[PDB]
Design a protein around this nucleic acid. Structure first.
Ligand code: ZN
Lengths: 70, 123, 54, 101, 90, 50
RNA sequence: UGAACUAUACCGUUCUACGGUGAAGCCAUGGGAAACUGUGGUGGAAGCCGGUCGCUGUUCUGACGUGCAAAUUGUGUAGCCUGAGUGC
RNA sequence: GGCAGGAAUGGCAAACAGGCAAGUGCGAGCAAGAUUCUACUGUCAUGGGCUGGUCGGUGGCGACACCCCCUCCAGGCAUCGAACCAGUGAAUCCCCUGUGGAGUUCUCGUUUCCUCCUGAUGCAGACUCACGCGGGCUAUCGAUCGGCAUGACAGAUGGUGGUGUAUGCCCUUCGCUCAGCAAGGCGGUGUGGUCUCACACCGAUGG
RNA sequence: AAGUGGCAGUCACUGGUUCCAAUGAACAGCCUGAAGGAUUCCCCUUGUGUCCGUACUGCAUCACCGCAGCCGGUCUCCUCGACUAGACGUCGCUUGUCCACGGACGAAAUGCAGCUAAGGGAAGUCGGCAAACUGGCCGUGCACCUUUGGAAGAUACGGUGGCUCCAGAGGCCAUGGCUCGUGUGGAACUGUUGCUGUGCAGGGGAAUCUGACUGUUUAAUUGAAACCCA
């Protein structure tokens, strides 16, 4: 897997035809977005508690946004 | 073989071994009607099959004895079986002595405490 | 002596189903067994009720 | 100054650890709580009180909770109630006296 | 302290093989093990790699000569005779 | 062990297939037929050369 | 016909506790006019020693000797165990 | 078919040597296979289709670093004995503090036992003066200054350039941080009907 | 911000050091350079990855060989805790197992095994055969002879527990906090003199013949003074 440097790289990865789904893990420490392109899972870790909400909004509506958190 | 299949499946599902698995003797019938790993899972969830806690190899004796030995209590000449070099090697004693003394000399050399001629002397 | 490719084409010809993958044993007696994993769109149960496996 | 609780409500509702087995337990604690490895040295370090159906250990000093579990198990053993009750951690700074299922 | 009197490097052989043979192998093995003088770099650095091969750890040179010593005696005289023969038939 | 040749595996499979008792209906064949299978191996008793 | 036991050569490859002892080389140092030399360490050699696995097979002329066994066996006793070692 | 190259026949032979690339849940679920199925997360080798102006360029004093096909020759990796010493890392093992569960409690024991975990992979990061593990090389300076020094258990070095210093440069074993990844696992505590089983909650991501 | 709880054996790597009259493969494959030459400008049986082995056993007490379900033999890998020098030996967690034809009767004689034995101490016997003595470690110390290396652990003497102390080595953070010698020496007390308390664990000395040594050997009666060696 690979990490994402920042949210603009996150968004350009989300804006690809080979990307299919974003998993959203809601941790106590942080919140991370796992984009499943082919050959790689791109994780973006963000610690802010409403930057995560704005990023989940930024995510285009064509992507399956699977929220994981237990 | 009455409950051998169930014991094997339970050992697998419990990650211990058939000698830590406890099959309820008052539920032998329902245990014998298990027939599958799914039903053994059900039985384990129901309590008719248990993972027995690992037996004890307590270390309190060794710990007290070790505290006393560090105090110097059971280390006399009547308790030593191996030669002094086999218990504590003279070579590793020399190695750590040389390292200690060279570290000390080199700390003193880095500071303006000794000349380099005095350093080489003592080295 | 069927290859996995032979088995793929033969499966798609007998029952027009796209095989996602084929794995093959030669079972002890000397028969050759084949698992044919269908594409997710296909349904091995909906195909078996045709073939007669029920 | 940490708080710790031992919840005796489950037995006190069934009249087993209800009336003054609780105060006997409190006195057991006042006897046996060890501070720096000594007994009777719990003055200005540990105060045991009772919020009714649950005992409350207030700790000015670095105190342990597994120690309280140990001492409640000792009191249950001395009162023979351990055959019927279990100490269970239901919350940090809290133990509870439950029944066996 | 001094650990032997006559036996030298031949202490490894202990009591075996005979005194007069341990003598010869001592004379040989002292040289086989010693570092010899490099007439190229001027340092006593030739280590015997194999039989007849001597590598200099400072200069890096690699020379062929001598089973147990860098230069045999016949080699040192052959160099001289060949030199003088070339000198005369220049 | 696990390592085999395809030829060896085919032969072992044929031996497994042969290791079978006579059908029940065979004794009743009018002209008195075989009663039991006299060519029947067992892994313990007799080993295959192979 | 046979080198599946077994003998040996080659190709590839494996295995070798724990100690004793203390060779060369080296460091400090005492003596001496010098050549040389005393002492304390370091170092870790050897078809070196004890000894485990292991291999071999001394002795009891033990067991068994219609055996566990057409050669094994002992709650023994022994040989070697860094090598000309060892197996595949 | 022409031209130009092109000594030295074709193979067999190692399931231990050479030789591309996969890990975890050892599970979704097995009665019985599993680095093979499965869910995730990856890696490798290789093919086809499509879209008057040509010695790749640059930075560094240097060790070097960065971004943007063809022939022949010279080398190298593959690649190689054994033993011994020292170092670092791994897992194992143990200790301290704390948690969760369990055993003992006639007396003592803040006690005894288990658990508290982290794989491949990443053109991710910080060091690499290994300021944790060490070799090589570079530049500057030019030593024994008359008592040579540096660094090692032992070696070992040094005007064929020591010590000291620095944008130092390189490679490698690691280790560490992040992603994988906590959702999993481990020790538990419960709810719901129950069923030919899903949910909830808690408990070191310690030194 | 981004080694580090500890240290033991194993493994890996690293830096070396020793040994050799021994120097410890090849090929495929891959890469770099040197010199030349030449230079039009995302999608596809989820592309291809086809073929064969894939159960279980496997130092087996029943899966192989030995006529067998034979105390024999048979290749490699991993390998915990305590005592200890320990991969010895003894016991224990994990794992696995209670299977070897059994039962009664204190169980004759004889036997095969384990032990003891007064007084004597080889008088037994071809012969000290067999068993016994000794046994680890620490300190002191050690003769003849010698190829100067050894002999040698010569021979020998003393000690060894438990507890309470006294000394004694290092490291990190910053001369205080913390970690900190199971590794040593001394002393006091103590005990029905006894402590390597168990398993384990040299008896020693003095000569003659002989082979120098180490190594080899008749699988299944001879291990030797035989063979080999330098
Ligand atoms: Zn030279």
């Amino acid at each position: 897997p690979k990490e994402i440097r920042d949210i603009k790289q996150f968004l350009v990865i989300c804006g690809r035809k080979d990307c299919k789904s974003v998993k959203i893990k809601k941790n106590v420490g942080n919140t991370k977005f796992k984009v499943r392109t082919k050959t790689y899972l791109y994780t973006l870790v963000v610690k802010d508690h409403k930057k995560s909400e704005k990023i989940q909004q930024s995510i285009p509506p064509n992507i399956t946004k699977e929220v994981i958190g237990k | 073989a009455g409950l051998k299949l169930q014991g094997r499946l339970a050992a697998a599902l419990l990650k211990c071994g058939r000698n830590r698995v406890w099959l309820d003797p008052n539920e032998t019938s329902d245990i014998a009607m298990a027939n599958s790993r799914a039903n053994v899972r059900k039985l384990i969830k129901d309590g008719f099959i248990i993972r027995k806690p690992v037996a004890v190899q307590s270390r309190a004796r060794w710990r007290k004895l070790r505290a006393a030995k560090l105090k110097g209590r059971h280390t006399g000449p009547g308790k030593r079986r191996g030669t002094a070099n086999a218990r504590m090697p003279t070579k590793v004693l020399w190695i750590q002595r040389q390292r200690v003394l060279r570290r000390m000399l080199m700390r003193y050399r880095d500071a303006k405490k000794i000349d380099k001629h005095l350093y080489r002397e003592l080295y | 002596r069927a290859n996995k490719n032979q088995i793929k084409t033969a499966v798609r010809k007998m029952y027009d189903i796209k095989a996602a993958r084929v794995n093959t044993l030669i079972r002890p007696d000397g028969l050759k067994k084949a698992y044919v994993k269908l594409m997710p769109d296909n349904d091995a149960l909906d195909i078996a009720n045709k073939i007669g496996i029920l | 100054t940490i708080e710790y609780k031992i919840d005796c409500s489950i037995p006190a509702a069934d009249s087993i650890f209800d009336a003054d087995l609780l105060k006997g337990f409190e006195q057991f604690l006042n006897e046996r709580i060890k501070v720096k490895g000594r007994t009777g040295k719990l003055r200005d370090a540990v105060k045991v009180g009772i919020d009714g159906t649950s005992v409350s250990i207030k700790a000015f000093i670095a105190f342990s909770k597994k120690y309280l579990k140990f001492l409640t198990k000792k009191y249950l053993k001395k009162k023979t109630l351990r055959d019927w009750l279990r100490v269970v951690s239901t919350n940090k700074t809290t133990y509870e006296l439950r029944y066996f299922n | 302290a001094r650990r032997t009197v006559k036996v030298g490097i031949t202490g490894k052989y202990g009591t075996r093989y005979g005194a007069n043979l341990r003598k010869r192998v001592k004379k040989i093995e002292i040289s086989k093990k010693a570092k010899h003088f490099c007439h190229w770099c001027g340092k006593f650095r030739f280590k015997r790699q194999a039989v007849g091969i001597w590598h200099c750890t400072s200069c890096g040179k690699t020379m062929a000569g001598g089973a147990w010593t860098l230069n045999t005696g016949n080699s040192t005289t052959v160099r001289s005779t060949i030199r003088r023969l070339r000198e005369m038939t220049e | 062990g696990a390592i085999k040749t395809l030829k060896q595996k085919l032969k072992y499979g044929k031996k497994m297939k042969q290791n079978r008792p006579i059908p029940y209906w065979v004794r009743f064949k009018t002209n008195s037929k075989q009663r039991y299978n006299e060519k029947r191996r067992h892994w313990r008793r007799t080993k295959l050369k192979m």
